[PDB]
Design a protein around this ligand. Structure first.
Ligand code: NAG
Ligand code: NAG
Ligand code: GLU
Ligand code: GLU
Lengths: 433, 445
């Protein structure tokens, strides 16, 4: 029920391999992009570190990767395997509410944590989450970027849509706070999507948004699956062209919310932290087969869901050839989160074991508080050549790329229309409606 | 010693806010005389009365492991680890909702039933997130509805909301906001939040933010003891007596802590509290407590110094209610009834598992958490005040409240019972008194 890899130093991992189940079910449908891609990015990163002769010489990094199932309660059970009083550090989680609950226990046993996706402003508080760090910026900057985008387009009358939980509510709250302080932004209504929605709830939300027909723009902090079902309801009610979607990093440039629903999502403006597609991971992931990828205990489930068969399956399918494949947006952030942990251990080794290849007797047990100090201090170029750094709160700088979902003929893409680095740089020329 | 250990056949865990949260990061601060000591000592009292009894849990002694939460959920999580390893069969507490929630997260994994005496957050009713949680106090769903009715009855259709950072404050105000949005003509001017770790001058800044809507004089308040005190302190400092019309939740209740030495600024404040009565039995027990006989309570020496204003200066011959002012804390009844609920459930479980034996039989050697929870939800007994104690499917008490108003006659201050809320409002407007306005705020909106 987990991925175990032996090594000198063991790194913990938390990934949403499955979505949350319906009503009273813990785990649901497997996430191909948000789950497998990101999980496999950690294993790839560790493979690359272990291969290297310069970084952590004569030292093998081990793995303990667990499934969160998108639930914070389920992830809490899993996180108990990291503690008993050996896990030196933990990578994850993805969802903020999941990362918050895990951070609560990890700080008691002094285990450093680096997230690749969690953006909730609460997590930057060192009094509550001292052992938490992240390679993504807090939602404070993303909310401000949204207010700037809304201002630039002249949409002074907007509506907010949020998933229940920390990420959704805190994202919208920050947007509401900043818009109240500035002039020309007014909110028509706030809609909240429940954790366990009753049948027909998403259709009611669209109907509620249609109570204010002049509020066409909808700023939304909703999770991957919630956006899809919102767009699904809007498609059924023929609301194509009416709404003007503003999506957060949970939307980003993902394929999951827009698959088979391209027309309804046309013109949607989305935000995602600065990232690039990693070529090395693409070469690795495309060459994965049922035979060579036995480490991944969830890879057989992925195979069935990815190629649309049952182990019907020939067994000799190819990931990029037999099915459409594009690297998940936050794959870079996963790899950089692993390298952040690795460089910190490397810098700790350089001080505890001077001129000693391998782990010296002094570095038999890695001190958590000391390791946290090294993580917050690292400064290196990541998997894309971009610098990776942490501030006093363990945050990355507020740097984003602004996309827009555009169709030319029958080809779909998230085209870069701007970037936000303290100030908005929106290219109005490149936008399409 | 950092905890209260009392040995027995069946050990019951306890979580109490003996100390308040320290300033800016500091885990523990000032000792709570009423919220901490009164309630903690109420559990020890209840257990003494159960152990003495020949009919309830015959030939069986209830043990104790009581811990301090320091009003912090992070601190309480560290303490709650002592309850688990791979024996504690029941937990009483906590007080704060956010504290109870964080403890309930770990307790359900090791299947330990939990009964709270104070925690009122609506989220705790969910048997998906917190199936092993129960409470002898009603959820804030009812209290917020009660507050709406009071506001409707008084004609205050333009209100502001004030909340402490955390589950109790935020979701208490949210419940009030959601009801106001769905039905009625009650409008909300602004929603303010009190920071968990406030900087110097924060409470004066909050009062000044509330003045940014001068028409909204009425303030719905879901804040803890310490926050209410400092809010009223800032209002006195900024000379705002008569202006604000406070609507306080059970965290305000009929408590002395926020109004002590600040009687004038709190005049006219309307407060809510679940139905309760003062128990004479506990008063007789708590008054006769000395430094010599109460060695069980490891925090009693600290309480002594704080209660009489001396240093262990102290004669040693001081007496509770005689040398210092004393009144039983409002939620003492709920602590005792929470302990008795755990006792009656174990009694009812004993009756099915050991139908003949008097005392722990071989089948009662290990207490199953899932089994005990079923008995806790099924108990039906009259409590320490004669009031019936029941639990619904979600493990909640019915929504039954009393409404108070803080009134000053001449040289006497009290919380006068001005009404009650039991599914519907019964408010006596004739018995209400108001403070004189010293400062007026003109509006231009
Ligand atoms: C790696 O470690 C092993 C065992 O400690 C040792 O025998 C070997 O010489 C080391 N390799 C290098 C290149 O130092
Ligand atoms: C109480 O328990 C003890 C020890 O098991 C036993 O000897 C005694 O008889 C019991 N008392 C009664 C009244 O049954
Ligand atoms: N930024 C989101 C995570 C969304 C994702 O996994 O892309 C959160 O903090 O919950
Ligand atoms: N009702 C408050 C507890 C206040 C008290 O202890 O009086 C809460 O749920 O946090």
């Amino acid at each position: 029920h987990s991925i175990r890899v032996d090594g000198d130093i063991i790194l913990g991992g938390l990934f949403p391999v499955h979505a949350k189940g319906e009503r009273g079910v813990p785990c649901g449908e497997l996430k191909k992009e948000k789950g497998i891609h990101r999980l496999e990015a950690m294993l790839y990163a560790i493979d690359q570190i272990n291969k290297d002769p310069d970084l952590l010489s004569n030292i093998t990094l081990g793995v303990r990767i667990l499934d969160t199932c998108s639930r914070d309660t389920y992830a809490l059970e899993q996180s108990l395997t990291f503690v008993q009083a050996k896990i030196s550090g933990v990578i994850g989680a993805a969802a903020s509410s999941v990362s918050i609950m895990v951070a609560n226990i990890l700080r008691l046993f002094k285990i450093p944590q680096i997230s690749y996706a969690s953006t909730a402003p609460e997590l930057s508080d060192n009094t509550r989450y001292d052992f938490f760090s992240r390679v993504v910026p807090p939602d404070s900057y993303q909310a401000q970027a949204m207010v700037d985008i809304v201002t630039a387009l002249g949409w002074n009358y907007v509506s907010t849509l949020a998933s229940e939980g920390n990420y959704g509510e805190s994202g919208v709250e920050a947007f509401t706070q900043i818009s109240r302080e500035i002039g020309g932004v007014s909110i028509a209504q706030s809609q909240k999507i429940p954790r366990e929605p009753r049948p027909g709830e998403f259709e009611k939300i669209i109907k509620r948004l249609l109570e204010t027909p002049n509020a066409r723009a909808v700023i939304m902090f909703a999770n991957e699956d919630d956006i899809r079902r919102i767009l699904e309801a809007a498609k059924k009610l023929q609301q194509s062209g009416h709404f003007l979607w503003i999506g957060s990093d949970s939307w980003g440039s993902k394929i999951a919310p827009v698959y088979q629903q391209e027309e309804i999502a046309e013109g949607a403006v989305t935000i995602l932290p600065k990232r690039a597609s990693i070529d090395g991971f693409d070469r690795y992931f495309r060459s994965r087969t049922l035979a060579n990828n036995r480490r991944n205990v969830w890879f057989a489930e992925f195979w069935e869901e990815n190629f649309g068969c049952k182990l019907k399956c020939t067994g000799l399918e190819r990931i990029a050839r037999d099915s459409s494949y594009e690297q998940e947006g936050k794959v870079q952030f996963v790899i950089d989160a692993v390298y952040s942990m690795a460089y910190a251990l490397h810098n700790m080794h350089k001080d505890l074991c001077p001129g000693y290849i391998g782990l010296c007797p002094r570095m038999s047990t890695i001190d958590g508080k000391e390791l946290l100090g090294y993580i917050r201090a690292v400064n290196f170029n990541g998997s894309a050549g971009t610098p990776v750094t942490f501030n006093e709160n363990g945050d990355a700088p507020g740097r984003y790329d602004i996309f827009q979902y555009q169709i030319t003929n029958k080809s779909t893409e998230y085209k870069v229309i701007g970037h936000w680095t303290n100030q908005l740089h929106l290219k109005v020329e490149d936008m399409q409606w």
